Design a protein around this nucleic acid. Sequence first.
RNA 1: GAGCUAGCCCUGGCCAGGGUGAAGCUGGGGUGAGACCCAGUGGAGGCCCGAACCGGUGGGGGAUGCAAACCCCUCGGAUGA
RNA 2: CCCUCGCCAAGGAACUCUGCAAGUUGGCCCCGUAACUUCGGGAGAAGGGGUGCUCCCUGGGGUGAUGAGCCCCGGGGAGCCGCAGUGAACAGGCUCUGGCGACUGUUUACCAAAAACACAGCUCUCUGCGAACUCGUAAGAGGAGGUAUAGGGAGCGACGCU
RNA 3: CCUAAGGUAGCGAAAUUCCUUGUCGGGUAAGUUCCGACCUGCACGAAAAGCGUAACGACCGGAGCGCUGUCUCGGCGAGGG
RNA 4: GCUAGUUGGUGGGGUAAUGGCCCACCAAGGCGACGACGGGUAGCCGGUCUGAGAGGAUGGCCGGCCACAGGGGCACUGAG
RNA 5: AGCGCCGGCCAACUCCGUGCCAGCAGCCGCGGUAAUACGGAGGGCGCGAGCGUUACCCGGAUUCACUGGGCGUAAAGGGC
RNA 6: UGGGAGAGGGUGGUGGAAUUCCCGGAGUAGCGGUGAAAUGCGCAGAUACCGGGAGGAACGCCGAUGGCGAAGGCAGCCACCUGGUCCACCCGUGACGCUGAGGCGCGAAAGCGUGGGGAGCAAACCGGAUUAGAUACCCGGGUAGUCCACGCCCUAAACGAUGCGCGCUAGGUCUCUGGGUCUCCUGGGGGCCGAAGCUAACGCGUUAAGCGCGCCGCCUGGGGAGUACGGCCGCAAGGC
RNA 7: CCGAGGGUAGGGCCCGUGACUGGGGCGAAGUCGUAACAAGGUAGCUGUACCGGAAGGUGCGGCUGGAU
Lengths: 88, 275
Amino acid sequence: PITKEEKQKVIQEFARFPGDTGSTEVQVALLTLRINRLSEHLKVHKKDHHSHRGLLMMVGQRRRLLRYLQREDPERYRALIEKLGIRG
Amino acid sequence: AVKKFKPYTPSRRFMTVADFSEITKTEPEKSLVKPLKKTGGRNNQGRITVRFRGGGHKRLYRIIDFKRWDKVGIPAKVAAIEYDPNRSARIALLHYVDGEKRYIIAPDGLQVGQQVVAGPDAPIQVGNALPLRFIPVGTVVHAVELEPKKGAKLARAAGTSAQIQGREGDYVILRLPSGELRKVHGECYATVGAVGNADHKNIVLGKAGRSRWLGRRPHVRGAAMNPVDHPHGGGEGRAPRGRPPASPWGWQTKGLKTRKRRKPSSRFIIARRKK
RNA sequence: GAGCUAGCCCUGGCCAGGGUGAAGCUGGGGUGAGACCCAGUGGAGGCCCGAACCGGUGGGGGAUGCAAACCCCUCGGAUGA
RNA sequence: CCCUCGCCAAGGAACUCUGCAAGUUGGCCCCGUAACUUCGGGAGAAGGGGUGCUCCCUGGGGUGAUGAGCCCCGGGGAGCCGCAGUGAACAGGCUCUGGCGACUGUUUACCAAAAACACAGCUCUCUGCGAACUCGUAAGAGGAGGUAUAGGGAGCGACGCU
RNA sequence: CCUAAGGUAGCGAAAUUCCUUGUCGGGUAAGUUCCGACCUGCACGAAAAGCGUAACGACCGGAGCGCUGUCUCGGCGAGGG
RNA sequence: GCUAGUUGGUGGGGUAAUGGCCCACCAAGGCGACGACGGGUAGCCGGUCUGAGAGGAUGGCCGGCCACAGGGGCACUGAG
RNA sequence: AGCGCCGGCCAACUCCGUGCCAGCAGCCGCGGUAAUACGGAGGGCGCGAGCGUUACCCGGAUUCACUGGGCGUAAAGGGC
RNA sequence: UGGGAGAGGGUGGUGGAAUUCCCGGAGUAGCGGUGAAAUGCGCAGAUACCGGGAGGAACGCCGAUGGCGAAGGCAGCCACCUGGUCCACCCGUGACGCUGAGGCGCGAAAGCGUGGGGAGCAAACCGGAUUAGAUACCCGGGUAGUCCACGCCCUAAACGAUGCGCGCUAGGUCUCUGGGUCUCCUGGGGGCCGAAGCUAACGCGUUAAGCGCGCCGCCUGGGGAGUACGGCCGCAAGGC
RNA sequence: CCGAGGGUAGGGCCCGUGACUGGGGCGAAGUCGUAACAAGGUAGCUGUACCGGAAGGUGCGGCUGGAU
Ligand SMILES: [Mg+2]
Ligand SMILES: [Mg+2]
Ligand SMILES: [Mg+2]
Ligand SMILES: [Mg+2]
Ligand SMILES: [Mg+2]
Ligand SMILES: [Mg+2]
Ligand SMILES: [Mg+2]
Ligand SMILES: [Mg+2]
Ligand SMILES: [Mg+2]
Ligand SMILES: [Mg+2]
Ligand SMILES: [Mg+2]
Ligand SMILES: [Mg+2]
Ligand SMILES: [Mg+2]
Ligand SMILES: [Mg+2]
Ligand SMILES: [Mg+2]
Ligand SMILES: [Mg+2]
Ligand SMILES: [Mg+2]
Ligand SMILES: [Mg+2]
Ligand SMILES: [Mg+2]
Ligand SMILES: [Mg+2]
Ligand SMILES: [Mg+2]
Ligand SMILES: [Mg+2]
Ligand SMILES: [Mg+2]
Ligand SMILES: [Mg+2]
Ligand SMILES: [Mg+2]
Ligand SMILES: [Mg+2]
Ligand SMILES: [Mg+2]
Ligand SMILES: [Mg+2]
Ligand SMILES: [Mg+2]
Ligand SMILES: [Mg+2]
Ligand SMILES: [Mg+2]
Ligand SMILES: [Mg+2]
Ligand SMILES: [Mg+2]
Ligand SMILES: [Mg+2]
Ligand SMILES: [Mg+2]
Ligand SMILES: [Mg+2]
Ligand SMILES: [Mg+2]
Ligand SMILES: [Mg+2]
Ligand SMILES: [Mg+2]
Ligand SMILES: [Mg+2]
Ligand SMILES: [Mg+2]
Ligand SMILES: [Mg+2]
Ligand SMILES: [Mg+2]
Ligand SMILES: [Mg+2]
Ligand SMILES: [Mg+2]
Ligand SMILES: [Mg+2]
Ligand SMILES: [Mg+2]
Ligand SMILES: [Mg+2]
Ligand SMILES: [Mg+2]
Ligand SMILES: [Mg+2]
Ligand SMILES: [Mg+2]
Ligand SMILES: [Mg+2]
Ligand SMILES: [Mg+2]
Ligand SMILES: [Mg+2]
Ligand SMILES: [Mg+2]
Ligand SMILES: [Mg+2]
Ligand SMILES: [Mg+2]
Ligand SMILES: [Mg+2]
Ligand SMILES: [Mg+2]
Ligand SMILES: [Mg+2]
Ligand SMILES: [Mg+2]
Ligand SMILES: [Mg+2]
Ligand SMILES: [Mg+2]
Ligand SMILES: [Mg+2]
Ligand SMILES: [Mg+2]
Ligand SMILES: [Mg+2]
Ligand SMILES: [Mg+2]
Ligand SMILES: [Mg+2]
Ligand SMILES: [Mg+2]
Ligand SMILES: [Mg+2]
Ligand SMILES: [Mg+2]
Ligand SMILES: [Mg+2]
Ligand SMILES: [Mg+2]
Ligand SMILES: [Mg+2]
Ligand SMILES: [Mg+2]
Ligand SMILES: [Mg+2]
Ligand SMILES: [Mg+2]
Ligand SMILES: [Mg+2]
Ligand SMILES: [Mg+2]
Ligand SMILES: [Mg+2]
Ligand SMILES: [Mg+2]
Ligand SMILES: [Mg+2]
Ligand SMILES: [Mg+2]
Ligand SMILES: [Mg+2]
Ligand SMILES: [Mg+2]
Ligand SMILES: [Mg+2]
Ligand SMILES: [Mg+2]
Ligand SMILES: [Mg+2]
Ligand SMILES: [Mg+2]
Ligand SMILES: [Mg+2]
Ligand SMILES: [Mg+2]
Ligand SMILES: [Mg+2]
Ligand SMILES: [Mg+2]
Ligand SMILES: [Mg+2]
Ligand SMILES: [Mg+2]
Ligand SMILES: [Mg+2]
Ligand SMILES: [Mg+2]
Ligand SMILES: [Mg+2]
Ligand SMILES: [Mg+2]
Ligand SMILES: [Mg+2]
Ligand SMILES: [Mg+2]
Ligand SMILES: [Mg+2]
Ligand SMILES: [Mg+2]
Ligand SMILES: [Mg+2]
Ligand SMILES: [Mg+2]
Ligand SMILES: [Mg+2]
Ligand SMILES: [Mg+2]
Ligand SMILES: [Mg+2]
Ligand SMILES: [Mg+2]
Ligand SMILES: [Mg+2]
Ligand SMILES: [Mg+2]
Ligand SMILES: [Mg+2]
Ligand SMILES: [Mg+2]
Ligand SMILES: [Mg+2]
Ligand SMILES: [Mg+2]
Ligand SMILES: [Mg+2]
Ligand SMILES: [Mg+2]
Ligand SMILES: [Mg+2]
Ligand SMILES: [Mg+2]
Ligand SMILES: [Mg+2]
Ligand SMILES: [Mg+2]
Ligand SMILES: [Mg+2]
Ligand SMILES: [Mg+2]
Ligand SMILES: [Mg+2]
Ligand SMILES: [Mg+2]
Ligand SMILES: [Mg+2]
Ligand SMILES: [Mg+2]
Ligand SMILES: [Mg+2]
Ligand SMILES: [Mg+2]
Ligand SMILES: [Mg+2]
Ligand SMILES: [Mg+2]
Ligand SMILES: [Mg+2]
Ligand SMILES: [Mg+2]
Ligand SMILES: [Mg+2]
Ligand SMILES: [Mg+2]
Ligand SMILES: [Mg+2]
Ligand SMILES: [Mg+2]
Ligand SMILES: [Mg+2]
Ligand SMILES: [Mg+2]
Ligand SMILES: [Mg+2]
Ligand SMILES: [Mg+2]
Ligand SMILES: [Mg+2]
Ligand SMILES: [Mg+2]
Ligand SMILES: [Mg+2]
Ligand SMILES: [Mg+2]
Ligand SMILES: [Mg+2]
Ligand SMILES: [Mg+2]
Ligand SMILES: [Mg+2]
Ligand SMILES: [Mg+2]
Ligand SMILES: [Mg+2]
Ligand SMILES: [Mg+2]
Ligand SMILES: [Mg+2]
Ligand SMILES: [Mg+2]
Ligand SMILES: [Mg+2]
Ligand SMILES: [Mg+2]
Ligand SMILES: [Mg+2]
Ligand SMILES: [Mg+2]
Ligand SMILES: [Mg+2]
Ligand SMILES: [Mg+2]
Ligand SMILES: [Mg+2]
Ligand SMILES: [Mg+2]
Ligand SMILES: [Mg+2]
Ligand SMILES: [Mg+2]
Ligand SMILES: [Mg+2]
Ligand SMILES: [Mg+2]
Ligand SMILES: [Mg+2]
Ligand SMILES: [Mg+2]
Ligand SMILES: [Mg+2]
Ligand SMILES: [Mg+2]
Ligand SMILES: [Mg+2]
Ligand SMILES: [Mg+2]
Ligand SMILES: [Mg+2]
Ligand SMILES: [Mg+2]
Ligand SMILES: [Mg+2]
Ligand SMILES: [Mg+2]
Ligand SMILES: [Mg+2]
Ligand SMILES: [Mg+2]
Ligand SMILES: [Mg+2]
Ligand SMILES: [Mg+2]
Ligand SMILES: [Mg+2]
Ligand SMILES: [Mg+2]
Ligand SMILES: [Mg+2]
Ligand SMILES: [Mg+2]
Ligand SMILES: [Mg+2]
Ligand SMILES: [Mg+2]
Ligand SMILES: [Mg+2]
Ligand SMILES: [Mg+2]
Ligand SMILES: [Mg+2]
Ligand SMILES: [Mg+2]
Ligand SMILES: [Mg+2]
Ligand SMILES: [Mg+2]
Ligand SMILES: [Mg+2]
Ligand SMILES: [Mg+2]
Ligand SMILES: [Mg+2]
Ligand SMILES: [Mg+2]
Ligand SMILES: [Mg+2]
Ligand SMILES: [Mg+2]
Ligand SMILES: [Mg+2]
Ligand SMILES: [Mg+2]
Ligand SMILES: [Mg+2]
Ligand SMILES: [Mg+2]
Ligand SMILES: [Mg+2]
Ligand SMILES: [Mg+2]
Ligand SMILES: [Mg+2]
Ligand SMILES: [Mg+2]
Ligand SMILES: [Mg+2]
Ligand SMILES: [Mg+2]
Ligand SMILES: [Mg+2]
Ligand SMILES: [Mg+2]
Ligand SMILES: [Mg+2]
Ligand SMILES: [Mg+2]
Ligand SMILES: [Mg+2]
Ligand SMILES: [Mg+2]
Ligand SMILES: [Mg+2]
Ligand SMILES: [Mg+2]
Ligand SMILES: [Mg+2]
Ligand SMILES: [Mg+2]
Ligand SMILES: [Mg+2]
Ligand SMILES: [Mg+2]
Ligand SMILES: [Mg+2]
Ligand SMILES: [Mg+2]
Ligand SMILES: [Mg+2]
Ligand SMILES: [Mg+2]
Ligand SMILES: [Mg+2]
Ligand SMILES: [Mg+2]
Ligand SMILES: [Mg+2]
Ligand SMILES: [Mg+2]
Ligand SMILES: [Mg+2]
Ligand SMILES: [Mg+2]
Ligand SMILES: [Mg+2]
Ligand SMILES: [Mg+2]
Ligand SMILES: [Mg+2]
Ligand SMILES: [Mg+2]
Ligand SMILES: [Mg+2]
Ligand SMILES: [Mg+2]
Ligand SMILES: [Mg+2]
Ligand SMILES: [Mg+2]
Ligand SMILES: [Mg+2]
Ligand SMILES: [Mg+2]
Ligand SMILES: [Mg+2]
Ligand SMILES: [Mg+2]
Ligand SMILES: [Mg+2]
Ligand SMILES: [Mg+2]
Ligand SMILES: [Mg+2]
Ligand SMILES: [Mg+2]
Ligand SMILES: [Mg+2]
Ligand SMILES: [Mg+2]
Ligand SMILES: [Mg+2]
Ligand SMILES: [Mg+2]
Ligand SMILES: [Mg+2]
Ligand SMILES: [Mg+2]
Ligand SMILES: [Mg+2]
Ligand SMILES: [Mg+2]
Ligand SMILES: [Mg+2]
Ligand SMILES: [Mg+2]
Ligand SMILES: [Mg+2]
Ligand SMILES: [Mg+2]
Ligand SMILES: [Mg+2]
Ligand SMILES: [Mg+2]
Ligand SMILES: [Mg+2]
Ligand SMILES: [Mg+2]
Ligand SMILES: [Mg+2]
Ligand SMILES: [Mg+2]
Ligand SMILES: [Mg+2]
Ligand SMILES: [Mg+2]
Ligand SMILES: [Mg+2]
Ligand SMILES: [Mg+2]
Ligand SMILES: [Mg+2]
Ligand SMILES: [Mg+2]
Ligand SMILES: [Mg+2]
Ligand SMILES: [Mg+2]
Ligand SMILES: [Mg+2]
Ligand SMILES: [Mg+2]
Ligand SMILES: [Mg+2]
Ligand SMILES: [Mg+2]
Ligand SMILES: [Mg+2]
């Protein structure tokens, strides 16, 4: 799967402050991570519809956060989706 | 994956073409080609002996290595996969570390860059050739010789394969593409894997013109002829067969078995084809 | 006897000009990614119109002919079997 | 009188087996275009408007040099003449609706071009390779320097529903 | 009663229907043709395929518009005879 | 899904006067699931009938406003 | 001075005629030889220059439920 | 952050039992089948028995009133890839939420297209019975299909005939699976009986059909009829 | 110039009508069988598919709103 180390690296890279876990950017980034990994999975396993539901849920989850983040601070939003290359 | 066309002519509506995706090189090795002398279906007396042939695209013959036991132990790199107008399979250019270059028919799954080798000690991997006796029972195979050193005769068409079913003394039992069960001598070489271009059979010619490109001239029905010409010839208006359906030469053509009874190979054929 | 004619084989040659505008490619849109849509590009096809060329549809003429199959008008194919 | 040709009052298919023949239409630009459809088409559907010449203003391109000149493709005004401006010549009549054949093709050289043959495609069947099958007394050839996703024979004839 | 078994789907006066110009409906002033129907199918029918089908056709039907010396019905003129 | 006087602009014309009301050019806009566009029905209101009320139904007679004058277009005269 | 009604809803009953016929009927239903339900009569009830009928509107209809309804099995949870 | 359970999904492999068929052996007069029969199979050697082989499909025991999933649905075993979910810590973010017309995706079986595969079973079909008849039920055969890949179809007693979310309102008992300190306690599921309450009744009852709020879907007498017409979708069947 | 309208051509919607054809509702005094309600004499119902004079049957899968 996705390892403990790799997750740590993402978290520390988007953490707003030294200990920061669960902030929006960290959440969006963790989701962005899972999303992209699943996307690749589904490209090969087109017939795994059940996991695709998982993908929709993650996408849904990230969407809400980004609306929130963009509601609060447009600046951190624009920089986050750019840092992740997300809009489209 | 066969390629379709939009119906922008009446014929393009149904025409499909091979996608040619496995093909990496579009020119043949000059030292491995020779002219294919077209016959028009005529023999050395000048007579038509196979009807309705001729007028197809000019072709060069690619020399194919149907022996392999020729260069035992010498590995070769798969240099390219090419089109061969003279057969349904694709062909693969081998560069032997020898410096010798030869063609084989391309197996399904063969990759340019990969290495293949022939011999009793060859790994059991796609593209390698071994005597049948050293190939594991159950593995599917192709380009099978029928008698030792006489060259690959069996399972050469696109998409075909034979399967090793068992061993019995000097012989091994194959299921041929036809479903026929047969003993083949163990020293006969075969190449592991199935013949590639498996989608060949899904091609829809689409128009009369395409048959002509292939050297197939229009086939005319016996029922369309006159009694001088054919058993089915004649009759006022359309006519049913009016006798057992027959060849132009008078022999029956629905069911009449034609393989020679007292043929020596009958001792080696275990079960006649299916379907 | 295949210097006519039918088929095939080998090797050459020919097909004015105009029209339609397939795939693909690029860009844009779209989506989680896609499908896909739009534009530009592109230049496919026993595609279209029409000479050469190959034909021979209807009519008229000719009928001890210009001619033992021709002439006029009209008409089919014209990158393809 | 015959041939080839030109025109014709009023009528306009009443001719005749049949509009046969002959008229009509006719190029380009623009507008516009139905059922149905396999979404390509049907389509040049149909139908209609424009079309010459003169002067004035102007937009891009090619060759130059970035300019003049030359050559090419446009646009906008205002006018003039005739019955008539693709002013001659070359240049679809159209629509609705059935039958048959899917289609482009092929044919009775010299009375039949068709609904006939062929055709992609469908199915049956034979053939394990020194294949079956074909030609040959044979040798030898074709099949095929192919190998059952292949080759022969037969019927049916795109496709849809069977 | 008979048969090996008794024609299914679909289509049907049909490139098939003798009686026949069947009957009814449409179109026409008037329609042995044409189109739509009906079905006692003389004598359709499922790869000698059955029923349909966009596009295509110098194929063969039926109707209308346009336009005409095809005609009412013929006249004059030209050139070659 | 609708839209070429269509939506906006500039300039004129026209009116008692604003306005694409009308014209010329410039721009590519305007409207729509809060129902555009299209179809059907209807003149609207004060009121009236009913109903516990809410609501439902209705708008003849009287009053107010609108629209029409056989069907349709048009301007003239005039404070209108 | 007339008109409707007198089985139940709904106020008003008997005799004869008829015998699933003729007929009545708003709903439920009446009529097959002792019919308060058909037809007449006597009598009765209700209105009265009117009485009944047909049509239509609101009511009863919390039967589109805002006031004021529902959806396991009655009609009603969207396959997720 | 640290853990847990599971037929959740996808892909590639792989195991054994049994059925059928084929080969070899051995053997003989029947076998099969039913309520009873007959068709059928069998001296051209069947059935029953032994060994060999081929092939497809489904996974016995475990297995449960069990588990998982949003639903459809998911069951030999291995591996890889991957979804949901629960718990404990109470570490981070700071209302980021609920629902959800349209839209999009998924969606048992049957059915469709192209290609494979085909042992068993089995629409249609053929035959035997049964019966007054028997286009059935039962029996002997038997093709699609059932299976695989890809693409369609989009239905259902697709059911809990019960939309989703949240808060609140006795308990008793069985069970699955976590965490405790392991008596028992506390989470999350799955049942049963029941407090109050609801209900036309039957029944429901902390897995509500009770008491409340939010949003969506839906009903408005039976037939005609999920029909016709229009539209949209589908290759068709036919769906909305 | 615009312009009532007229004319030519081609589309869209709605109404009436049509040989014939499909099923539906009602009638009932008929013919055939008896599919459902009981275990309704093959438990029922169901989506789909194929089939049969008819109700209906069978296959595949589903539900219990199934008696014992
Ligand atoms: Mg998640
Ligand atoms: Mg966003
Ligand atoms: Mg390929
Ligand atoms: Mg394509
Ligand atoms: Mg194609
Ligand atoms: Mg294409
Ligand atoms: Mg075509
Ligand atoms: Mg290609
Ligand atoms: Mg290739
Ligand atoms: Mg080359
Ligand atoms: Mg050379
Ligand atoms: Mg050389
Ligand atoms: Mg050669
Ligand atoms: Mg040769
Ligand atoms: Mg020679
Ligand atoms: Mg010779
Ligand atoms: Mg000779
Ligand atoms: Mg031949
Ligand atoms: Mg030949
Ligand atoms: Mg090749
Ligand atoms: Mg190929
Ligand atoms: Mg093919
Ligand atoms: Mg060729
Ligand atoms: Mg051929
Ligand atoms: Mg032929
Ligand atoms: Mg002939
Ligand atoms: Mg001869
Ligand atoms: Mg002879
Ligand atoms: Mg003969
Ligand atoms: Mg014959
Ligand atoms: Mg004959
Ligand atoms: Mg003949
Ligand atoms: Mg005949
Ligand atoms: Mg003939
Ligand atoms: Mg013939
Ligand atoms: Mg013929
Ligand atoms: Mg025959
Ligand atoms: Mg004959
Ligand atoms: Mg015969
Ligand atoms: Mg022979
Ligand atoms: Mg041999
Ligand atoms: Mg010659
Ligand atoms: Mg010659
Ligand atoms: Mg040459
Ligand atoms: Mg050449
Ligand atoms: Mg030349
Ligand atoms: Mg040419
Ligand atoms: Mg050209
Ligand atoms: Mg050219
Ligand atoms: Mg050209
Ligand atoms: Mg272009
Ligand atoms: Mg390209
Ligand atoms: Mg393009
Ligand atoms: Mg071109
Ligand atoms: Mg171009
Ligand atoms: Mg062409
Ligand atoms: Mg061309
Ligand atoms: Mg052309
Ligand atoms: Mg020639
Ligand atoms: Mg010539
Ligand atoms: Mg000629
Ligand atoms: Mg010719
Ligand atoms: Mg001629
Ligand atoms: Mg002519
Ligand atoms: Mg001629
Ligand atoms: Mg003439
Ligand atoms: Mg002539
Ligand atoms: Mg003549
Ligand atoms: Mg002559
Ligand atoms: Mg000539
Ligand atoms: Mg000529
Ligand atoms: Mg011409
Ligand atoms: Mg020509
Ligand atoms: Mg032409
Ligand atoms: Mg052509
Ligand atoms: Mg042409
Ligand atoms: Mg050309
Ligand atoms: Mg051509
Ligand atoms: Mg050529
Ligand atoms: Mg002349
Ligand atoms: Mg005249
Ligand atoms: Mg005139
Ligand atoms: Mg006329
Ligand atoms: Mg006229
Ligand atoms: Mg006439
Ligand atoms: Mg006449
Ligand atoms: Mg005619
Ligand atoms: Mg003509
Ligand atoms: Mg003309
Ligand atoms: Mg012309
Ligand atoms: Mg002409
Ligand atoms: Mg039309
Ligand atoms: Mg047409
Ligand atoms: Mg179209
Ligand atoms: Mg086309
Ligand atoms: Mg035109
Ligand atoms: Mg047309
Ligand atoms: Mg014109
Ligand atoms: Mg002009
Ligand atoms: Mg000029
Ligand atoms: Mg002039
Ligand atoms: Mg130059
Ligand atoms: Mg210049
Ligand atoms: Mg003019
Ligand atoms: Mg013109
Ligand atoms: Mg002129
Ligand atoms: Mg000329
Ligand atoms: Mg002229
Ligand atoms: Mg033309
Ligand atoms: Mg004409
Ligand atoms: Mg037409
Ligand atoms: Mg025609
Ligand atoms: Mg017809
Ligand atoms: Mg006819
Ligand atoms: Mg036809
Ligand atoms: Mg043809
Ligand atoms: Mg023909
Ligand atoms: Mg066809
Ligand atoms: Mg054809
Ligand atoms: Mg046909
Ligand atoms: Mg053709
Ligand atoms: Mg051609
Ligand atoms: Mg042709
Ligand atoms: Mg032809
Ligand atoms: Mg001749
Ligand atoms: Mg001839
Ligand atoms: Mg001759
Ligand atoms: Mg001759
Ligand atoms: Mg001749
Ligand atoms: Mg001729
Ligand atoms: Mg001819
Ligand atoms: Mg022709
Ligand atoms: Mg001719
Ligand atoms: Mg034919
Ligand atoms: Mg022919
Ligand atoms: Mg033919
Ligand atoms: Mg076919
Ligand atoms: Mg096929
Ligand atoms: Mg031979
Ligand atoms: Mg011979
Ligand atoms: Mg011989
Ligand atoms: Mg030889
Ligand atoms: Mg040879
Ligand atoms: Mg040879
Ligand atoms: Mg050879
Ligand atoms: Mg071959
Ligand atoms: Mg043919
Ligand atoms: Mg034929
Ligand atoms: Mg079709
Ligand atoms: Mg018959
Ligand atoms: Mg039958
Ligand atoms: Mg008939
Ligand atoms: Mg008739
Ligand atoms: Mg017919
Ligand atoms: Mg007949
Ligand atoms: Mg006769
Ligand atoms: Mg007749
Ligand atoms: Mg006759
Ligand atoms: Mg008649
Ligand atoms: Mg009439
Ligand atoms: Mg008539
Ligand atoms: Mg008539
Ligand atoms: Mg006629
Ligand atoms: Mg005729
Ligand atoms: Mg007819
Ligand atoms: Mg009759
Ligand atoms: Mg026939
Ligand atoms: Mg025949
Ligand atoms: Mg025929
Ligand atoms: Mg036949
Ligand atoms: Mg045919
Ligand atoms: Mg037909
Ligand atoms: Mg047709
Ligand atoms: Mg043609
Ligand atoms: Mg033709
Ligand atoms: Mg006319
Ligand atoms: Mg004349
Ligand atoms: Mg004269
Ligand atoms: Mg003259
Ligand atoms: Mg003269
Ligand atoms: Mg003269
Ligand atoms: Mg003269
Ligand atoms: Mg202004
Ligand atoms: Mg005024
Ligand atoms: Mg305006
Ligand atoms: Mg303007
Ligand atoms: Mg503009
Ligand atoms: Mg609304
Ligand atoms: Mg109105
Ligand atoms: Mg009104
Ligand atoms: Mg009330
Ligand atoms: Mg009103
Ligand atoms: Mg009133
Ligand atoms: Mg008033
Ligand atoms: Mg008015
Ligand atoms: Mg007026
Ligand atoms: Mg009046
Ligand atoms: Mg007036
Ligand atoms: Mg009263
Ligand atoms: Mg009573
Ligand atoms: Mg009362
Ligand atoms: Mg009372
Ligand atoms: Mg009486
Ligand atoms: Mg009364
Ligand atoms: Mg009595
Ligand atoms: Mg009495
Ligand atoms: Mg009463
Ligand atoms: Mg009374
Ligand atoms: Mg009074
Ligand atoms: Mg009321
Ligand atoms: Mg109310
Ligand atoms: Mg309420
Ligand atoms: Mg209620
Ligand atoms: Mg609710
Ligand atoms: Mg219900
Ligand atoms: Mg539900
Ligand atoms: Mg974790
Ligand atoms: Mg045995
Ligand atoms: Mg055994
Ligand atoms: Mg169990
Ligand atoms: Mg359970
Ligand atoms: Mg659960
Ligand atoms: Mg905290
Ligand atoms: Mg804080
Ligand atoms: Mg939705
Ligand atoms: Mg499904
Ligand atoms: Mg299935
Ligand atoms: Mg199926
Ligand atoms: Mg099928
Ligand atoms: Mg299938
Ligand atoms: Mg098919
Ligand atoms: Mg299949
Ligand atoms: Mg089988
Ligand atoms: Mg039976
Ligand atoms: Mg019986
Ligand atoms: Mg009977
Ligand atoms: Mg039976
Ligand atoms: Mg059975
Ligand atoms: Mg069986
Ligand atoms: Mg079938
Ligand atoms: Mg099938
Ligand atoms: Mg089928
Ligand atoms: Mg599938
Ligand atoms: Mg749905
Ligand atoms: Mg259940
Ligand atoms: Mg549930
Ligand atoms: Mg439901
Ligand atoms: Mg909901
Ligand atoms: Mg524990
Ligand atoms: Mg516990
Ligand atoms: Mg619990
Ligand atoms: Mg309980
Ligand atoms: Mg209680
Ligand atoms: Mg309640
Ligand atoms: Mg509590
Ligand atoms: Mg409890
Ligand atoms: Mg729960
Ligand atoms: Mg309840
Ligand atoms: Mg109803
Ligand atoms: Mg429907
Ligand atoms: Mg339905
Ligand atoms: Mg419809
Ligand atoms: Mg539904
Ligand atoms: Mg006007
Ligand atoms: Mg007008
Ligand atoms: Mg006028
Ligand atoms: Mg009727
Ligand atoms: Mg039953
Ligand atoms: Mg019963
Ligand atoms: Mg029963
Ligand atoms: Mg069923
Ligand atoms: Mg039937
Ligand atoms: Mg019967
Ligand atoms: Mg049955
Ligand atoms: Mg079942
Ligand atoms: Mg279920």
